[PDB]
Amino acid sequence: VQDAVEKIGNRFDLVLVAARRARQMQSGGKDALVPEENDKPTVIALREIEEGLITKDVLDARERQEQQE
Amino acid sequence: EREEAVVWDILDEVIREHPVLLNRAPTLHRLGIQAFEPVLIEGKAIQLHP
Amino acid sequence: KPLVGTGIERNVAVDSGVTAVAKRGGVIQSVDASRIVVKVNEEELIPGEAGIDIYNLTKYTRSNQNTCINQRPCVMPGEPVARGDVLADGPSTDLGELA
Amino acid sequence: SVTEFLKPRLVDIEQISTTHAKVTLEPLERGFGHTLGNALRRILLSSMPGCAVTEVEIEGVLHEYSTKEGVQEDILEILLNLKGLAVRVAEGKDEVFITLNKSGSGPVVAGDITHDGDVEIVNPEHVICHLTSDNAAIAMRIKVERGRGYVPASARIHERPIGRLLVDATFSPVDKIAYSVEAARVEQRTDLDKLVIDMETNGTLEPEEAIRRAATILAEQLDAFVDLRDV
Amino acid sequence: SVTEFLKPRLVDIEQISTTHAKVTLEPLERGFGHTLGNALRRILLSSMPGCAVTEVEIEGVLHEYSTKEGVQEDILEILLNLKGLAVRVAEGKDEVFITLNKSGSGPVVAGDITHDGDVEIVNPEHVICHLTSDNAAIAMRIKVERGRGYVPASARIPIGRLLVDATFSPVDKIAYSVEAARVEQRTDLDKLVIDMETNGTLEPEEAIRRAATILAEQLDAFV
Amino acid sequence: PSQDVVLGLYYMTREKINAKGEGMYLTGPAEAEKAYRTKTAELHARVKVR
Amino acid sequence: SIKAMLELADLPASGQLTLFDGRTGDAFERPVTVGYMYMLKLNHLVDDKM
């Protein structure tokens, strides 16, 4: 999780973001932004954070867009 | 309960990416509880990395 | 038996009571996994006695710690036995020695 | 030459005892002695087929942890003695039944087992039981099965009547394997080696047959190495 | 059946480089991974045929500890550089001689060796020695033979002849690991992973194939 | 590491005087592994390695 | 007395033998202490502790 903490900066904020994204994927039904490769939502969310597509700001903006829609 | 064959494949799919916390008493410091990825083994003893 | 011992095993085995110790000398009239009948010599016979001694052996009895207690005969039919000799070996005993 | 090797061949089978033998392989290149010796030792000690006692039925006996009148040894001891029984079953048969009916006083040995001619007892002097009374009688029906490896009673897949006593079976007939690489007196070449394999068994499996079977198993797996294609 | 064994089913070959490969067999019967791995390592490191440089004649050099002016590298380092020379010799030739002559300043590569056409150099960018001054010239007569295994200079112990360690076997590195493998409920099986790296004469798959063939032809008299 | 690991790495990194294969020249770590697996150079043999 | 009985048994006086690795077949380069020891099975089983 070194890449994830490098991209985020704080371990606790990284845990919060990853947990929120994993809950969205498991319950809401959002599709994975990265290839699954037979991985659980936790590892998928961590990989998405490491790549740089999922952050707190991105999640907040996406939620705002959904609420507007 | 019947210990069917497919239950073991289901177990090896649940365990795949689910961490488990190992603890030893006394817990003198925070390294006394750690998360590991389980590998399923025959027998009744927990195998620990040296 | 222990290959390397201290010579105390016989004392512990005899004084523990797990073994069957001959109360009187004589010759084993009959051997079985559950009973040993010894015909007592005619020098230790109290007048009017039958002349035989019967040792019933404990077979597969639960101990306090859920462990088998079993007495195993270590004697043949016809051989002579004296007093204090071991007729059956209890748990963790081999030929009268602690094992 | 530096490309064509010398194929080893069987030379002499020395049978010191019924359970002990020596097999000589000659000639061998430099370093092939140890390679073949370790491969054959590992195969022989691991996967040799053999016949072992699997289940027993004794009249008047309901479970292992019991005694019998006129019998000095408990039934568990009788089963432990039956585990050390060397039997050879004629090829083509997997399961056979043998009978041990003996009455009188004395040592009940493996030579009193009655067989239908497809089973040969290797150790007729194996002491199975002791009968301590003139009226003592023993009547047993023993199942002998062919297998490979070690199959305990628990590992057997699951109606079974009360009285059928399951016995842990050690099918492997090989007890001890040793091997030595020595100099071989070849006509011209002097860099050649000889492999002597000492095999201590129960007498069920012949030395020559054991060597060919181990070589066959190694050949089958090396075939999958030889092809080496993605599946 | 009592003679029915579990053959490999998943065979995966990963070619990280043209000379480096990883071969995985899964599954195997218990204990067979170590048997096969050890036998293959022994055959590939001590018994495979190959061609290597075994002897060198350098004009102006009489002993291995002697010195030659104009070369930055010492004689022993030149012999070491000649040890790692991947050479192929056409079949039917057991003893061949190749000459290397070079004058000037700068490195010498394996591509400056002139042969008779029956010898192929697999790594023509391999550096043998360096020339410092422009007045320094090097002449070398190299002997290449067919042999088996890894026979060094000490094991082979007559004027001016220098012995180079003979790396006949094309296998440069081999390492086998045995992991756990399962089918159904039998998880006691073995999984064999062989990492191999050759000089370049042979591909690692071809090395495994000839090692297995050499081991299999030895047991033909018993099968 | 502790115990067995330290003992193994210590025994591997020890120097023995006049061992089999002393003074040889080796192209690298792989060559040294090849030499020891072939029973040519002892594990405690002094060599020169590139 | 121990060495005298070892000599009477036609065994090395040091009590150390040359062992061979079963996996590889190569002898261990140092002699290894081999003998017989009385082992006990304590009443701490993993069957009733799991």
Side-chain angles (χ1 to χ4, degrees), chain E residues 41 45-46 76-77 80-81 83 150 152 169 171-173, chain F residues 24-27 30-31 33-35 37-38 40 48 50:
Chain E
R41 206 187 29 218
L45 284 190
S46 308
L76 305 151
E77 197 168 339
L80 178 79
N81 282 109
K83 167 160 39 182
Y150 174 56
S169 154
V171 202
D172 156 78
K173 177 182 187 53
Chain F
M24 299 180 0
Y25 278 49
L26 309 177
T27 48
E31 200 313 318
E33 214 275 343
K34 183 182 199 172
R37 298 286 177 195
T38 46
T40 292
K48 281 198 70 60
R50 210 206 294 279

PDB file of all heavy atoms in Angstrom, chain E residues 41 45-46 76-77 80-81 83 150 152 169 171-173, chain F residues 24-27 30-31 33-35 37-38 40 48 50:
ATOM      1  N   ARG E  41      18.900 -30.439 -12.534  1.00  0.00           N
ATOM      2  CA  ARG E  41      19.999 -29.525 -12.242  1.00  0.00           C
ATOM      3  C   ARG E  41      21.343 -30.219 -12.403  1.00  0.00           C
ATOM      4  O   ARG E  41      22.272 -29.657 -12.995  1.00  0.00           O
ATOM      5  CB  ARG E  41      19.876 -28.949 -10.831  1.00  0.00           C
ATOM      6  CG  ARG E  41      20.549 -27.597 -10.708  1.00  0.00           C
ATOM      7  CD  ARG E  41      20.610 -27.052  -9.293  1.00  0.00           C
ATOM      8  NE  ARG E  41      20.659 -28.094  -8.279  1.00  0.00           N
ATOM      9  CZ  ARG E  41      20.030 -28.028  -7.114  1.00  0.00           C
ATOM     10  NH1 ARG E  41      19.330 -26.960  -6.769  1.00  0.00           N
ATOM     11  NH2 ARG E  41      20.120 -29.050  -6.270  1.00  0.00           N
ATOM     12  N   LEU E  45      23.999 -29.034 -15.267  1.00  0.00           N
ATOM     13  CA  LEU E  45      25.198 -28.348 -14.811  1.00  0.00           C
ATOM     14  C   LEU E  45      26.461 -29.189 -14.907  1.00  0.00           C
ATOM     15  O   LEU E  45      27.557 -28.622 -14.925  1.00  0.00           O
ATOM     16  CB  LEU E  45      25.027 -27.884 -13.361  1.00  0.00           C
ATOM     17  CG  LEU E  45      24.143 -26.662 -13.128  1.00  0.00           C
ATOM     18  CD1 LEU E  45      24.279 -26.185 -11.699  1.00  0.00           C
ATOM     19  CD2 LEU E  45      24.492 -25.551 -14.098  1.00  0.00           C
ATOM     20  N   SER E  46      26.346 -30.515 -14.969  1.00  0.00           N
ATOM     21  CA  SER E  46      27.527 -31.360 -14.965  1.00  0.00           C
ATOM     22  C   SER E  46      27.567 -32.391 -16.083  1.00  0.00           C
ATOM     23  O   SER E  46      28.557 -33.125 -16.179  1.00  0.00           O
ATOM     24  CB  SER E  46      27.656 -32.082 -13.617  1.00  0.00           C
ATOM     25  OG  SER E  46      27.587 -31.164 -12.542  1.00  0.00           O
ATOM     26  N   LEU E  76      44.961 -13.155 -16.402  1.00  0.00           N
ATOM     27  CA  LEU E  76      43.895 -13.944 -15.796  1.00  0.00           C
ATOM     28  C   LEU E  76      42.525 -13.361 -16.115  1.00  0.00           C
ATOM     29  O   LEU E  76      41.564 -14.104 -16.344  1.00  0.00           O
ATOM     30  CB  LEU E  76      44.103 -14.046 -14.287  1.00  0.00           C
ATOM     31  CG  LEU E  76      45.456 -14.602 -13.841  1.00  0.00           C
ATOM     32  CD1 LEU E  76      45.850 -14.039 -12.485  1.00  0.00           C
ATOM     33  CD2 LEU E  76      45.417 -16.118 -13.807  1.00  0.00           C
ATOM     34  N   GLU E  77      42.416 -12.034 -16.154  1.00  0.00           N
ATOM     35  CA  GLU E  77      41.142 -11.428 -16.522  1.00  0.00           C
ATOM     36  C   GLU E  77      40.818 -11.659 -17.993  1.00  0.00           C
ATOM     37  O   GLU E  77      39.645 -11.809 -18.350  1.00  0.00           O
ATOM     38  CB  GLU E  77      41.153  -9.937 -16.198  1.00  0.00           C
ATOM     39  CG  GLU E  77      39.773  -9.311 -16.162  1.00  0.00           C
ATOM     40  CD  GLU E  77      39.776  -7.923 -15.558  1.00  0.00           C
ATOM     41  OE1 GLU E  77      40.730  -7.598 -14.820  1.00  0.00           O
ATOM     42  OE2 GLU E  77      38.822  -7.159 -15.814  1.00  0.00           O
ATOM     43  N   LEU E  80      39.426 -15.051 -18.060  1.00  0.00           N
ATOM     44  CA  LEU E  80      38.064 -14.997 -17.543  1.00  0.00           C
ATOM     45  C   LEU E  80      37.092 -14.489 -18.601  1.00  0.00           C
ATOM     46  O   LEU E  80      35.982 -15.016 -18.739  1.00  0.00           O
ATOM     47  CB  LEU E  80      38.019 -14.108 -16.304  1.00  0.00           C
ATOM     48  CG  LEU E  80      36.660 -13.889 -15.651  1.00  0.00           C
ATOM     49  CD1 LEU E  80      36.288 -15.091 -14.812  1.00  0.00           C
ATOM     50  CD2 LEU E  80      36.677 -12.631 -14.814  1.00  0.00           C
ATOM     51  N   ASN E  81      37.489 -13.461 -19.350  1.00  0.00           N
ATOM     52  CA  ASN E  81      36.643 -12.958 -20.427  1.00  0.00           C
ATOM     53  C   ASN E  81      36.464 -14.004 -21.520  1.00  0.00           C
ATOM     54  O   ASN E  81      35.393 -14.097 -22.128  1.00  0.00           O
ATOM     55  CB  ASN E  81      37.231 -11.675 -21.008  1.00  0.00           C
ATOM     56  CG  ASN E  81      36.974 -10.471 -20.134  1.00  0.00           C
ATOM     57  OD1 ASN E  81      37.885  -9.942 -19.503  1.00  0.00           O
ATOM     58  ND2 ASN E  81      35.725 -10.024 -20.097  1.00  0.00           N
ATOM     59  N   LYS E  83      36.379 -17.157 -20.949  1.00  0.00           N
ATOM     60  CA  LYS E  83      35.512 -18.205 -20.418  1.00  0.00           C
ATOM     61  C   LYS E  83      34.066 -17.988 -20.840  1.00  0.00           C
ATOM     62  O   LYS E  83      33.376 -18.938 -21.229  1.00  0.00           O
ATOM     63  CB  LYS E  83      35.624 -18.257 -18.894  1.00  0.00           C
ATOM     64  CG  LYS E  83      34.549 -19.099 -18.229  1.00  0.00           C
ATOM     65  CD  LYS E  83      34.943 -19.528 -16.823  1.00  0.00           C
ATOM     66  CE  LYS E  83      35.672 -18.430 -16.078  1.00  0.00           C
ATOM     67  NZ  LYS E  83      36.101 -18.877 -14.726  1.00  0.00           N
ATOM     68  N   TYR E 150      31.321 -28.812 -16.507  1.00  0.00           N
ATOM     69  CA  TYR E 150      32.085 -27.638 -16.088  1.00  0.00           C
ATOM     70  C   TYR E 150      33.424 -28.127 -15.547  1.00  0.00           C
ATOM     71  O   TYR E 150      33.553 -28.405 -14.352  1.00  0.00           O
ATOM     72  CB  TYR E 150      31.312 -26.845 -15.052  1.00  0.00           C
ATOM     73  CG  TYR E 150      32.069 -25.690 -14.458  1.00  0.00           C
ATOM     74  CD1 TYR E 150      32.603 -24.700 -15.265  1.00  0.00           C
ATOM     75  CD2 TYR E 150      32.243 -25.583 -13.090  1.00  0.00           C
ATOM     76  CE1 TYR E 150      33.292 -23.639 -14.723  1.00  0.00           C
ATOM     77  CE2 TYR E 150      32.931 -24.527 -12.540  1.00  0.00           C
ATOM     78  CZ  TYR E 150      33.454 -23.561 -13.360  1.00  0.00           C
ATOM     79  OH  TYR E 150      34.142 -22.502 -12.818  1.00  0.00           O
ATOM     80  N   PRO E 152      37.158 -27.111 -14.820  1.00  0.00           N
ATOM     81  CA  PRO E 152      37.997 -25.918 -14.698  1.00  0.00           C
ATOM     82  C   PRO E 152      39.437 -26.219 -15.104  1.00  0.00           C
ATOM     83  O   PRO E 152      39.778 -27.324 -15.519  1.00  0.00           O
ATOM     84  CB  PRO E 152      37.900 -25.566 -13.210  1.00  0.00           C
ATOM     85  CG  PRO E 152      36.858 -26.482 -12.642  1.00  0.00           C
ATOM     86  CD  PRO E 152      36.840 -27.682 -13.507  1.00  0.00           C
ATOM     87  N   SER E 169      28.681 -26.792 -20.689  1.00  0.00           N
ATOM     88  CA  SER E 169      27.228 -26.772 -20.620  1.00  0.00           C
ATOM     89  C   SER E 169      26.709 -25.366 -20.893  1.00  0.00           C
ATOM     90  O   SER E 169      27.178 -24.406 -20.270  1.00  0.00           O
ATOM     91  CB  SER E 169      26.757 -27.250 -19.252  1.00  0.00           C
ATOM     92  OG  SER E 169      25.490 -26.705 -18.934  1.00  0.00           O
ATOM     93  N   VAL E 171      24.084 -24.021 -19.916  1.00  0.00           N
ATOM     94  CA  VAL E 171      23.316 -23.483 -18.800  1.00  0.00           C
ATOM     95  C   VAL E 171      24.227 -22.632 -17.928  1.00  0.00           C
ATOM     96  O   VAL E 171      25.252 -23.105 -17.426  1.00  0.00           O
ATOM     97  CB  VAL E 171      22.668 -24.608 -17.987  1.00  0.00           C
ATOM     98  CG1 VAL E 171      21.484 -24.074 -17.203  1.00  0.00           C
ATOM     99  CG2 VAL E 171      22.238 -25.729 -18.901  1.00  0.00           C
ATOM    100  N   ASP E 172      23.852 -21.369 -17.742  1.00  0.00           N
ATOM    101  CA  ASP E 172      24.604 -20.466 -16.884  1.00  0.00           C
ATOM    102  C   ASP E 172      24.043 -20.427 -15.470  1.00  0.00           C
ATOM    103  O   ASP E 172      24.808 -20.406 -14.500  1.00  0.00           O
ATOM    104  CB  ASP E 172      24.612 -19.056 -17.480  1.00  0.00           C
ATOM    105  CG  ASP E 172      24.832 -17.982 -16.434  1.00  0.00           C
ATOM    106  OD1 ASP E 172      25.991 -17.790 -16.010  1.00  0.00           O
ATOM    107  OD2 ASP E 172      23.845 -17.325 -16.039  1.00  0.00           O
ATOM    108  N   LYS E 173      22.721 -20.419 -15.336  1.00  0.00           N
ATOM    109  CA  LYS E 173      22.078 -20.404 -14.033  1.00  0.00           C
ATOM    110  C   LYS E 173      20.833 -21.274 -14.078  1.00  0.00           C
ATOM    111  O   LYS E 173      20.075 -21.230 -15.048  1.00  0.00           O
ATOM    112  CB  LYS E 173      21.710 -18.976 -13.612  1.00  0.00           C
ATOM    113  CG  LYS E 173      20.959 -18.885 -12.297  1.00  0.00           C
ATOM    114  CD  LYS E 173      20.582 -17.449 -11.975  1.00  0.00           C
ATOM    115  CE  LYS E 173      19.988 -17.338 -10.581  1.00  0.00           C
ATOM    116  NZ  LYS E 173      20.878 -17.939  -9.549  1.00  0.00           N
TER     117      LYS E 173
ATOM    118  N   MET F  24      40.398 -19.318  -7.834  1.00  0.00           N
ATOM    119  CA  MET F  24      39.755 -19.314  -9.136  1.00  0.00           C
ATOM    120  C   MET F  24      39.176 -17.939  -9.442  1.00  0.00           C
ATOM    121  O   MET F  24      38.950 -17.115  -8.552  1.00  0.00           O
ATOM    122  CB  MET F  24      38.656 -20.375  -9.200  1.00  0.00           C
ATOM    123  CG  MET F  24      39.153 -21.793  -8.986  1.00  0.00           C
ATOM    124  SD  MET F  24      37.860 -23.048  -9.071  1.00  0.00           S
ATOM    125  CE  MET F  24      36.414 -22.048  -9.387  1.00  0.00           C
ATOM    126  N   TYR F  25      38.936 -17.695 -10.724  1.00  0.00           N
ATOM    127  CA  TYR F  25      38.365 -16.444 -11.199  1.00  0.00           C
ATOM    128  C   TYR F  25      36.968 -16.718 -11.735  1.00  0.00           C
ATOM    129  O   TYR F  25      36.780 -17.635 -12.543  1.00  0.00           O
ATOM    130  CB  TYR F  25      39.248 -15.819 -12.280  1.00  0.00           C
ATOM    131  CG  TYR F  25      40.412 -15.025 -11.736  1.00  0.00           C
ATOM    132  CD1 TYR F  25      41.241 -15.552 -10.759  1.00  0.00           C
ATOM    133  CD2 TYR F  25      40.689 -13.755 -12.208  1.00  0.00           C
ATOM    134  CE1 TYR F  25      42.304 -14.833 -10.263  1.00  0.00           C
ATOM    135  CE2 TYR F  25      41.752 -13.030 -11.718  1.00  0.00           C
ATOM    136  CZ  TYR F  25      42.554 -13.572 -10.746  1.00  0.00           C
ATOM    137  OH  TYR F  25      43.615 -12.848 -10.256  1.00  0.00           O
ATOM    138  N   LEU F  26      35.991 -15.935 -11.286  1.00  0.00           N
ATOM    139  CA  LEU F  26      34.593 -16.219 -11.562  1.00  0.00           C
ATOM    140  C   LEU F  26      33.948 -15.012 -12.223  1.00  0.00           C
ATOM    141  O   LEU F  26      34.203 -13.870 -11.833  1.00  0.00           O
ATOM    142  CB  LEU F  26      33.842 -16.574 -10.278  1.00  0.00           C
ATOM    143  CG  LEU F  26      34.486 -17.655  -9.405  1.00  0.00           C
ATOM    144  CD1 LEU F  26      33.696 -17.868  -8.120  1.00  0.00           C
ATOM    145  CD2 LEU F  26      34.729 -18.949 -10.139  1.00  0.00           C
ATOM    146  N   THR F  27      33.102 -15.270 -13.223  1.00  0.00           N
ATOM    147  CA  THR F  27      32.476 -14.187 -13.971  1.00  0.00           C
ATOM    148  C   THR F  27      31.412 -13.452 -13.168  1.00  0.00           C
ATOM    149  O   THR F  27      31.126 -12.289 -13.467  1.00  0.00           O
ATOM    150  CB  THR F  27      31.853 -14.720 -15.259  1.00  0.00           C
ATOM    151  OG1 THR F  27      31.074 -15.885 -14.968  1.00  0.00           O
ATOM    152  CG2 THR F  27      32.931 -15.082 -16.258  1.00  0.00           C
ATOM    153  N   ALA F  30      26.329 -16.028 -10.519  1.00  0.00           N
ATOM    154  CA  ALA F  30      25.801 -17.236 -11.137  1.00  0.00           C
ATOM    155  C   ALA F  30      26.902 -18.258 -11.365  1.00  0.00           C
ATOM    156  O   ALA F  30      26.694 -19.463 -11.185  1.00  0.00           O
ATOM    157  CB  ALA F  30      25.106 -16.890 -12.451  1.00  0.00           C
ATOM    158  N   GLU F  31      28.087 -17.791 -11.755  1.00  0.00           N
ATOM    159  CA  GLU F  31      29.201 -18.699 -11.986  1.00  0.00           C
ATOM    160  C   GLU F  31      29.612 -19.364 -10.677  1.00  0.00           C
ATOM    161  O   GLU F  31      29.900 -20.563 -10.648  1.00  0.00           O
ATOM    162  CB  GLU F  31      30.357 -17.918 -12.621  1.00  0.00           C
ATOM    163  CG  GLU F  31      31.442 -18.701 -13.388  1.00  0.00           C
ATOM    164  CD  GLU F  31      31.991 -19.932 -12.707  1.00  0.00           C
ATOM    165  OE1 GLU F  31      32.243 -19.903 -11.491  1.00  0.00           O
ATOM    166  OE2 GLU F  31      32.251 -20.918 -13.422  1.00  0.00           O
ATOM    167  N   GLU F  33      27.646 -19.941  -8.064  1.00  0.00           N
ATOM    168  CA  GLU F  33      26.628 -20.943  -7.771  1.00  0.00           C
ATOM    169  C   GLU F  33      26.852 -22.202  -8.597  1.00  0.00           C
ATOM    170  O   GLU F  33      26.767 -23.321  -8.077  1.00  0.00           O
ATOM    171  CB  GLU F  33      25.237 -20.367  -8.026  1.00  0.00           C
ATOM    172  CG  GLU F  33      24.164 -20.873  -7.080  1.00  0.00           C
ATOM    173  CD  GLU F  33      23.551 -22.183  -7.537  1.00  0.00           C
ATOM    174  OE1 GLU F  33      23.722 -22.540  -8.720  1.00  0.00           O
ATOM    175  OE2 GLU F  33      22.894 -22.854  -6.712  1.00  0.00           O
ATOM    176  N   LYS F  34      27.164 -22.036  -9.885  1.00  0.00           N
ATOM    177  CA  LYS F  34      27.447 -23.180 -10.744  1.00  0.00           C
ATOM    178  C   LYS F  34      28.649 -23.967 -10.240  1.00  0.00           C
ATOM    179  O   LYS F  34      28.655 -25.202 -10.278  1.00  0.00           O
ATOM    180  CB  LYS F  34      27.681 -22.700 -12.174  1.00  0.00           C
ATOM    181  CG  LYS F  34      27.922 -23.797 -13.188  1.00  0.00           C
ATOM    182  CD  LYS F  34      28.192 -23.201 -14.558  1.00  0.00           C
ATOM    183  CE  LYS F  34      27.981 -24.222 -15.659  1.00  0.00           C
ATOM    184  NZ  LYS F  34      28.059 -23.598 -17.008  1.00  0.00           N
ATOM    185  N   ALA F  35      29.679 -23.264  -9.770  1.00  0.00           N
ATOM    186  CA  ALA F  35      30.885 -23.926  -9.286  1.00  0.00           C
ATOM    187  C   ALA F  35      30.611 -24.738  -8.030  1.00  0.00           C
ATOM    188  O   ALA F  35      31.114 -25.858  -7.889  1.00  0.00           O
ATOM    189  CB  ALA F  35      31.980 -22.894  -9.025  1.00  0.00           C
ATOM    190  N   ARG F  37      27.602 -25.918  -6.995  1.00  0.00           N
ATOM    191  CA  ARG F  37      26.695 -27.022  -7.294  1.00  0.00           C
ATOM    192  C   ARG F  37      27.394 -28.169  -8.006  1.00  0.00           C
ATOM    193  O   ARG F  37      26.910 -29.303  -7.949  1.00  0.00           O
ATOM    194  CB  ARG F  37      25.521 -26.539  -8.141  1.00  0.00           C
ATOM    195  CG  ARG F  37      24.651 -25.501  -7.471  1.00  0.00           C
ATOM    196  CD  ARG F  37      23.780 -26.112  -6.398  1.00  0.00           C
ATOM    197  NE  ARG F  37      23.003 -25.098  -5.699  1.00  0.00           N
ATOM    198  CZ  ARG F  37      22.385 -25.294  -4.544  1.00  0.00           C
ATOM    199  NH1 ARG F  37      22.432 -26.462  -3.926  1.00  0.00           N
ATOM    200  NH2 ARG F  37      21.704 -24.293  -3.993  1.00  0.00           N
ATOM    201  N   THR F  38      28.514 -27.904  -8.671  1.00  0.00           N
ATOM    202  CA  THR F  38      29.270 -28.924  -9.380  1.00  0.00           C
ATOM    203  C   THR F  38      30.374 -29.539  -8.529  1.00  0.00           C
ATOM    204  O   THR F  38      31.173 -30.324  -9.049  1.00  0.00           O
ATOM    205  CB  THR F  38      29.869 -28.339 -10.660  1.00  0.00           C
ATOM    206  OG1 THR F  38      30.477 -27.076 -10.370  1.00  0.00           O
ATOM    207  CG2 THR F  38      28.790 -28.143 -11.707  1.00  0.00           C
ATOM    208  N   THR F  40      33.039 -28.213  -7.340  1.00  0.00           N
ATOM    209  CA  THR F  40      34.351 -27.744  -7.775  1.00  0.00           C
ATOM    210  C   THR F  40      35.008 -26.847  -6.734  1.00  0.00           C
ATOM    211  O   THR F  40      36.137 -27.107  -6.307  1.00  0.00           O
ATOM    212  CB  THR F  40      34.234 -26.998  -9.106  1.00  0.00           C
ATOM    213  OG1 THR F  40      33.877 -27.916 -10.146  1.00  0.00           O
ATOM    214  CG2 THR F  40      35.543 -26.317  -9.439  1.00  0.00           C
ATOM    215  N   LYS F  48      38.203 -14.641  -6.958  1.00  0.00           N
ATOM    216  CA  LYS F  48      38.041 -13.293  -7.485  1.00  0.00           C
ATOM    217  C   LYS F  48      36.825 -13.290  -8.398  1.00  0.00           C
ATOM    218  O   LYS F  48      36.776 -14.049  -9.372  1.00  0.00           O
ATOM    219  CB  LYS F  48      39.293 -12.835  -8.232  1.00  0.00           C
ATOM    220  CG  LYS F  48      40.410 -12.361  -7.317  1.00  0.00           C
ATOM    221  CD  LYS F  48      41.430 -11.516  -8.061  1.00  0.00           C
ATOM    222  CE  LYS F  48      40.853 -10.175  -8.466  1.00  0.00           C
ATOM    223  NZ  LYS F  48      40.414  -9.385  -7.286  1.00  0.00           N
ATOM    224  N   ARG F  50      33.844 -11.073 -10.600  1.00  0.00           N
ATOM    225  CA  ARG F  50      33.418  -9.848 -11.263  1.00  0.00           C
ATOM    226  C   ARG F  50      32.045  -9.470 -10.729  1.00  0.00           C
ATOM    227  O   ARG F  50      31.060 -10.172 -10.975  1.00  0.00           O
ATOM    228  CB  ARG F  50      33.381 -10.044 -12.774  1.00  0.00           C
ATOM    229  CG  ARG F  50      33.651  -8.789 -13.575  1.00  0.00           C
ATOM    230  CD  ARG F  50      32.998  -8.864 -14.942  1.00  0.00           C
ATOM    231  NE  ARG F  50      33.580  -9.908 -15.775  1.00  0.00           N
ATOM    232  CZ  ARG F  50      34.706  -9.778 -16.461  1.00  0.00           C
ATOM    233  NH1 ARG F  50      35.408  -8.657 -16.430  1.00  0.00           N
ATOM    234  NH2 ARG F  50      35.139 -10.798 -17.196  1.00  0.00           N
TER     235      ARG F  50
END
